Design a protein around this ligand. Structure first.
Ligand SMILES: [Mg+2]
Length: 1202
RNA sequence: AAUUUCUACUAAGUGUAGAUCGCAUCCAG
DNA sequence: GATGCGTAAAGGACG
DNA sequence: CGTCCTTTATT
């Protein structure tokens, strides 16, 4: 009984192994003499070029078929599509009509005589040359005759366009699912808004755009949709909506622009047409320091157009008073928060302005509408913002001083960068080496980008009642120029952030278009590549084109050393392969197939479905079985032991056996003398398949992929991992010069970087060079493999994880959370919520032999954040921080893998599509999404390297506890052993009571504060405890529906940390407040006394003191010692939860800090979810809904504690 | 600071620890 | 964010 | 013929 070990051999997946390929002997000389590499580097260039020419015919071919087409179901489909109350029967009716529509488009493509020719040899040899009209391009297409086979991959990418399936690549899909659905939506919008388009306005568009061939109304009739399948037709339809610019250039207004004016001018909100997506085939980074510089000078010197639009916007905003503040608008969004701070000094007073009119009891159903309606608003006028502005304060004037300040900052930064615009300037050093120059460009780009990004707010996305077009004329003219800095900024950064070395490479064919296509022995002459082994070393051997058979003649040498030559036989896709060989002209003549058999095949009765007859399919199997016996190329290669025919449920049952039997890998001896002579003579090319684990000096644990590779040829491996075909060989030219490599000279001691390492310095007897692998040309060999090619343990993973979780008595849960003080923090929890392990993942502990050395990745990040501060916020420091986090999570994955194996444990993770990230966490959402993906990816085939490969958990019996990754949005609910959970109320919660603070202690008014105090059931001093007790029922406050216990007694117990910062003792601070105002707090119930007080400074200190008492999380930024969590509520035994009572202990039963509390409580929501499983029937476990609500959570957190 | 490749390394001396699905194509803001 | 290949053996063109 | 390139068959 182990949950983990029921998840092996569940599904097949493909992986690629990568290696360095080191030439052996005369191989590199022979390759150099034959000029093979130069051929392939050129071929790659021409191959990329021919693909674009090939596109042109494909594109032209699409227009011919799409123009001719006429869709049959159109009117019937659109109607059914529009019904808003469809029976489930009618929804399937729509799907059939939708499938038929796509099938009409696909069959129109594939029904041509021409369609088959496009992806055959013929397109390059004959069709394309006649199509082209340029002598040079025809020569290029001509260079690839006899090399058509190498285009297959491209051909497949184009075959996807003509599919009838509902797939992103398809033409039919773009027409029917996306463009039709949009067209229908535009028909709906058109009839509502039809009238507002002026009689004159339409007749324009018909002459100016339509050219008088069609009426604008036609484009919104359903039967007219055929015109818009082509890119030409789409351009016209989108032109009507967007507006057109003639050959003369006269601006022609679009229907969507008309609607804008109308809704604007009348302060209404009618809808606007969606434009149609492009057709599927209709129509790069800076490469050098000289190019990067050239753009910086050209676009940002003092007489560039961007600098011209800055001077115009300075003149425009200098005249800000001259314009109408009622017709100047600020877009609603982040820019409202910023501009609110800019002039008042306060983010949320402009919030209060609109709140002042809109603002007293708050049901959250009213609160959402209260909150939702303000979000609905598109923008605010300067007049509305001045309606906010208290008297004596001018919103326009101090906006002017802020904008003008930003342009003066640009001009000062220009003077500091001025020598970077001299025509005389030349670059002394490379930019990445040249921190000074990169800092100069960054400073100028930033000051302009910030000015651009700030000024962008003055839009109002209008859609806006009468706008000051005198202001928005000059403004729009200049801003459209200024917006060019966005593209410039991104490109220059992406260049500075790049690595110094280049991974550019080109594929090697050795003059074979199907080079190294597969490893099968029979095909080894055709492919001219194979695999040799000598002891521990492996080699890729390549026969030269003039001597393809040279390896086949070699025989074993008894006396001398021998290579091990691979003997690889595969029967790939028997369902594909078995018929073609047995129904081929060559074999059909040999073997008389009864008319029943060719019937069954032509009829399709063997295939599962309504046409299926078990006997018919059985008969076909026996046909295949006898023919395999008659076909000795297969029967002799594979020891076929088929199950008795009667047992087969379907044809796939027979095929599955064939597929699993049809694989065999062994080795044959081959004279090492004879083979080596072949290499010397130039007839054979030999590379060692190499990574650092194959080094003579290598010792200790190898790479996981080193194990997969060696296991391919291990006889303890039995199809668990298959060696796949389609391997590719590349050449990556060096991108660094050996002289320009950083060297640590031999016999001089090198300073070690890790603080925790005891050894501070290392001295070697040899030189070591940074990035040495890129100072030389390097072959790399990519090898695909197939794991669990024939899976036996077929079940839906999630349903199985749910069944085991239900019946498992003590389920273990691994809760992972992101902390402010901790990169990641782990809590392991048993089936009843008891903490089993809790610790931070700030330090990764690496194990080699018995030695342990830790790496504090949190200290690493801190040192790199400090390095970011120094040298401003340099472009690279951000990258270095990004990659360090990306390499950190690759360490964390292994730690999670151990815990999962150790505790047979289910993982609990945050749902990142619902929760909101505080940004106090170090690991931002973008890095965590990466992590949760890697997690999923590892758990498709979870393996412990140090385990023996044949054991479950080992490299041949990997755990499959997770389904293949789909999308970040799919990282929700559950993926096998991984559960995704909202982070809500997981940190600011008392773990010993489930208590949470649902009160709003923000001070608004004296009257608001009185109603707050009166809503408590009692407020009294407790002499026998020296505490103030606040009995409350949450029913008497608003937005308290989620809480379950409702009745709580708060206490002013212990200290809090007010935020600089000060420590506040709650009990004495209440006494201090009450004594300041003469309140007798010892006189039983005090509630009357506090409300009697008439001073506003009293209620503000009181609400502030309530805020602190209900502030359960207390921290000092920069003081990692102080992150304590303290509860104002007693538990069953009258104890207050204080996290510091447990951070002292080594094994604590409750969370040790706020960060541990989060991981603890993320894990507990899975426990609730397991509780939901144990409630349901085994059959309906699929139906159980995992997502926990804030109401369900608070009930579980407050009842399960006991 | 060496790497199939990435990060952290130097890990006891040409390397350590973990991770690593390649290749082509299309569509998106 | 999705597509598709990870192939041996039939089949044919060219000397 | 051979040899090299092409085309093919799909639960
Ligand atoms: Mg190692």
């Amino acid at each position: 009984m182990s949950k983990l070990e029921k998840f092996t051999n569940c599904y097949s997946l493909s992986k690629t192994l990568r290696f360095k390929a080191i030439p052996v002997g005369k191989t590199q000389e022979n390759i150099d003499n034959k000029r093979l590499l130069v051929e392939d580097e050129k071929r790659a260039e021409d191959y990329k070029g021919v693909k674009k020419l090939l596109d042109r015919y494909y594109l032209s071919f699409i227009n011919d078929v799409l123009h001719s087409i006429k869709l049959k179901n159109l009117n019937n489909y659109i109607s059914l599509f529009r019904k808003k109350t469809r029976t489930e029967k009618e929804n399937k009716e729509l799907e059939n009509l939708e499938i038929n529509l796509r099938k009409e488009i696909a069959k129109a493509f594939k029904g041509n005589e021409g369609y088959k020719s496009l992806f055959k040899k013929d397109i390059i040899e004959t069709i394309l040359p006649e199509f082209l009209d340029d002598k040079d391009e025809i020569a290029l297409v001509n260079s690839f005759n006899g090399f058509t086979t190498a285009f297959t991959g491209f051909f497949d990418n184009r075959e996807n366009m003509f599919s009838e399936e509902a797939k992103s690549t398809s033409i039919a899909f773009r027409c029917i699912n996306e463009n039709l659905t949009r067209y229908i939506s535009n028909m709906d919008i058109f009839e509502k808004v039809d009238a507002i388009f002026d009689k004159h306005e339409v007749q324009e568009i018909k002459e100016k755009i339509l050219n008088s061939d069609y009426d604008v109304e036609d484009f919104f009739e359903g039967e007219f949709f055929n015109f818009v399948l082509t890119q030409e037709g789409i351009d016209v339809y989108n032109a009507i909506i967007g507006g057109f610019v003639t050959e003369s250039g006269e601006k022609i207004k679009g229907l969507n622009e008309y609607i804008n004016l109308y809704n604007q001018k009348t302060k209404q909100k009618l809808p606007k047409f969606k434009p149609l997506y492009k057709q599927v085939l209709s129509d790069e980074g800076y490469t050098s320091d000289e190019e990067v510089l050239e753009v910086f000078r050209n676009t940002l010197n003092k007489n560039s157009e961007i600098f011209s639009s800055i001077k115009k916007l300075e003149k425009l905003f200098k005249n800000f008073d001259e314009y109408s503040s009622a017709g100047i608008f600020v877009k609603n969004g982040p820019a409202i928060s910023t501009i609110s701070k800019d002039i008042f000094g306060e983010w949320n007073v402009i919030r209060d302005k609109w709140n002042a009119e809109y603002d007293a009891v708050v049901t959250e159903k009213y609160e959402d509408d209260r909150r939702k309606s303000f979000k609905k608003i598109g923008s605010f006028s300067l007049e509305q913002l001045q309606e906010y502005a208290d008297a004596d304060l001018s919103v326009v004037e101090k906006l002017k001083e802020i904008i003008i300040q930003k342009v003066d900052e640009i001009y000062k930064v220009y003077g500091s960068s001025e020598k970077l615009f001299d025509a005389d300037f030349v670059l002394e050093k490379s930019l990445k080496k040249n921190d000074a120059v990169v800092a100069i460009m960054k400073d100028l780009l930033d000051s302009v980008k910030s000015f651009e990004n700030y000024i962008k707010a003055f839009f109002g996305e209008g859609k806006e009642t009468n706008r000051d077009e005198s202001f928005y004329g000059d403004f729009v003219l200049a801003y459209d120029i200024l917006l060019k800095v966005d593209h410039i900024y991104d490109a220059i950064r992406n260049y500075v952030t790049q690595k110094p070395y280049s991974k550019d490479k080109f594929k090697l064919y050795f003059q074979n278009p199907q080079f190294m296509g597969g490893w099968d022995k029979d095909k080894e002459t055709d492919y001219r590549a194979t695999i040799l082994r000598y002891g521990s070393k492996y080699y890729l051997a390549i026969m030269d084109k003039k001597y393809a058979k040279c390896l086949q003649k070699i025989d074993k040498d008894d006396v001398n050393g021998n290579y091990e030559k691979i003997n690889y036989k595969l029967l790939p896709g028997p369902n594909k392969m078995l018929p073609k060989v047995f129904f081929s002209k060559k074999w059909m003549a040999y073997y008389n197939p009864s008319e029943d058999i060719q019937k069954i095949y032509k009829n399709g009765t063997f295939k599962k479905g309504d046409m299926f007859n078990l006997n018919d399919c059985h008969k076909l199997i026996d046909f295949f079985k006898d023919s395999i016996s008659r076909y000795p190329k297969w029967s002799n290669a594979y020891d076929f032991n088929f199950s008795e025919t009667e047992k087969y449920k379907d044809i796939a049952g027979f095929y599955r056996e064939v597929e699993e039997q049809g694989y065999k890998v062994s080795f044959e001896s081959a004279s090492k003398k004879e083979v080596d002579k072949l290499v010397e003579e130039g007839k054979l090319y030999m590379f060692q398949i190499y990574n650092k684990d194959f080094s003579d000096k290598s010792h200790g644990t190898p790479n996981l992929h080193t194990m997969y590779f060696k296991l391919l040829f291990d006889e303890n491996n039995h199809g668990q991992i298959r060696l796949s075909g389609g391997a590719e060989l590349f050449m990556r030219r060096a991108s660094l010069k050996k002289e320009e490599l950083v060297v640590h000279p031999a016999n001089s001691p090198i300073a070690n970087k890790n603080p925790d390492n005891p050894k501070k310095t290392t001295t070697l007897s040899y030189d070591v060079y940074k990035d040495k692998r890129f100072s030389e040309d390097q072959y790399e060999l990519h090898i695909p493999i197939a794991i669990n090619k024939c899976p036996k343990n077929i079940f839906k993973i999630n349903t199985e994880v749910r069944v085991l979780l239900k019946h498992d008595d003590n389920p273990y849960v691994i809760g992972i959370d992101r902390g402010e003080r901790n990169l990641l923090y782990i809590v392991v929890v048993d089936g009843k919520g008891n903490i089993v392990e809790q610790y931070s993942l700030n330090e990764i502990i690496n194990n080699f032999n018995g030695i342990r050395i830790k790496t504090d990745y949190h200290s690493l990040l801190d040192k790199k954040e400090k390095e970011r501060f120094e040298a401003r916020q340099n472009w690279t420091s951000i990258e270095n921080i990004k990659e360090l986090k990306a390499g950190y999570i690759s360490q964390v994955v292994h730690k999670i893998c151990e815990l999962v194996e150790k505790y047979d444990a289910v993982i609990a993770l945050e749902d990142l599509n619902s929760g909101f990230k505080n940004s106090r966490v170090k690991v931002e959402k973008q890095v965590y999404q990466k992590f949760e993906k890697m997690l999923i990816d590892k758990l498709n085939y979870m393996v412990d390297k140090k385990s023996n490969p044949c054991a479950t958990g080992g490299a041949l019996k990997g755990y499959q506890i997770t389904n293949k990754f789909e999308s970040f949005k799919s990282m929700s609910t559950q993926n096998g052993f991984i559960f995704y959970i909202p982070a809500w109320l997981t940190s600011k919660i008392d773990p010993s009571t489930g208590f949470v603070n649902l009160l709003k202690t923000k001070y608004t008014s004296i009257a608001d504060s009185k109603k707050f105090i009166s809503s408590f059931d009692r407020i009294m001093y407790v002499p026998e405890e020296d505490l103030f007790e606040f009995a409350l029922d949450y029913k008497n406050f608003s937005r308290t529906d989620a809480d379950y216990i409702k009745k709580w007694k708060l206490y002013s117990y212990g200290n809090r940390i007010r935020i600089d910062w000060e420590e506040v003792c709650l009990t004495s601070a209440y006494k201090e407040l009450f004594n300041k105002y003469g309140i007798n707090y010892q006189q039983g119930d005090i509630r009357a006394l506090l409300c009697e007080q008439s001073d506003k400074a009293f209620y503000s200190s009181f609400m502030a003191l309530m805020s602190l008492m209900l502030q359960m999380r207390n921290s000092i930024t920069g003081r990692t010692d102080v992150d304590f969590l303290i509860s104002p509520v007693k538990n069953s035994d009258g104890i207050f939860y204080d996290s510091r009572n447990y951070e002292a202990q080594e094994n604590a039963i409750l969370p040790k800090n706020a960060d541990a509390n989060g991981a603890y409580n993320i894990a507990r929501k899975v426990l609730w979810a397991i509780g939901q499983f144990k409630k349901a029937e085994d059959e309906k476990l699929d139906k159980v809904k995992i997502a926990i609500s804030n109401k369900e959570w608070l009930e579980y957190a407050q009842t399960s504690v006991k």
